[PDB]
Amino acid sequence: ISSETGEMGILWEFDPIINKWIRLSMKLKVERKPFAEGALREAYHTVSLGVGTDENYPLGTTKLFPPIEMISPISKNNEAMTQLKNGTKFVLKLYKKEQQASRELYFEDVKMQMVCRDWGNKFNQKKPPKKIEFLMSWVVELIDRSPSSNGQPILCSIEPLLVGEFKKNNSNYGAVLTNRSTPQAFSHFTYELSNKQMIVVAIQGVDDLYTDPQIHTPDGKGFGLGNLGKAGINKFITTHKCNAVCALLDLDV
Ligand SMILES: Nc1ncnc2c1ncn2[C@@H]1O[C@H](COP(=O)(O)OP(=O)(O)OP(=O)(O)O)[C@@H](O)[C@H]1O
Numbered sequence: 001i002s003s004e005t006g007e008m009g010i011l012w013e014f015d016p017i018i019n020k021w022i023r024l025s026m027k028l029k030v031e032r033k034p035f036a037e038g039a040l041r042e043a044y045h046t047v048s049l050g051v052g053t054d055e056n057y058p059l060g061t062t063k064l065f066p067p068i069e070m071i072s073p074i075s076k077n078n079e080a081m082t083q084l085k086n087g088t089k090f091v092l093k094l095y096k097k098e099q100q101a102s103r104e105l106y107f108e109d110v111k112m113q114m115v116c117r118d119w120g121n122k123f124n125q126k127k128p129p130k131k132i133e134f135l136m137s138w139v140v141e142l143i144d145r146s147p148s149s150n151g152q153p154i155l156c157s158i159e160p161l162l163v164g165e166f167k168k169n170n171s172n173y174g175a176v177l178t179n180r181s182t183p184q185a186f187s188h189f190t191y192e193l194s195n196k197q198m199i200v201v202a203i204q205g206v207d208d209l210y211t212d213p214q215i216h217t218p219d220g221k222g223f224g225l226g227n228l229g230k231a232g233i234n235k236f237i238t239t240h241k242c243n244a245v246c247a248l249l250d251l252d253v
């Protein structure tokens with residue numbers, strides 16, 4: 001953590017393999033205006049002023065989210081310390097004018113992204129023609145900012161900066177928006193290999209470095225408000241045509 005000058009944040013990293021959140025602190029400097037926006041969020045260029053521990057910001061005043069038993073007591077090891085080290089340029093995302101964004105939802109979005117990141121590794125283990133990867137994402141509590149009209153602290157999510165032409169390959173409701181095979185085959189892979197317990201769609205990013213994915217599950221629970229359940233899964237099916245990569249992976253037509 002550097003001096004000076006920016007704003008402090010509590011930084012949360014989820015680690016799927018121990019199934020725990022890792023709580024840290026960082027300092028960051030964010031541009032006043034967004035460089036981009038989509039249906040739900042605005043994105044801002046940001047630079048890291050370093051990552052440190054959470055010692056100064058005691059947890060549990062009580063009523064915790066995430067609850068204490070979901071939090072690692074040790075945080076010495078994490079991705080943030082290298083990927084957001086001092087001087088790193090990265091992206092910060094805020095929900096637009098939010099009504100429906102509870103605290104739990106931000107953590108849901110980050111966890112969802114980490115799950116998708118596991119699916120990417122699993123896809124890559126089949127050695128397809130093009131490997132894929134999902135970016136890290138983290139929750140940040142912007143503790144230096146005045147709480148909202150309702151007294152909630154300001155939350156956001158952050159992720160690495162993608163350099164290149166950002167493209168959306170499918171949506172979370174049936175749209176197939178480019179001719180590329182790998183993104184559609186990856187979505188189908190997740191459906192079949194999960195035994196239809198889930199699907200990853202809204203495959204989008206620069207080349208095969210993806211971010212902002214969306215998972216549908218049949219019960220429609222969790223995975224944020226973009227989880228459209230069976231309906232989302234079925235929409236994907238109606239517009240999906242298998243391609244050579246699906247064939248290479250031996251997926252059912
Ligand atoms: N990591 C990144 N690096 C560079 N640009 C990004 C990155 N993530 C998002 N963007 C840009 O910011 C825009 C909005 O971000 P994002 O897609 O995460 O939110 P959203 O648009 O609300 O989600 P959706 O469009 O799927 O509803 C994107 O459409 C893209 O132009």
Ligand SMILES: [Zn+2]
Binds near residue numbers: 185240
């Ligand atoms: Zn297919």
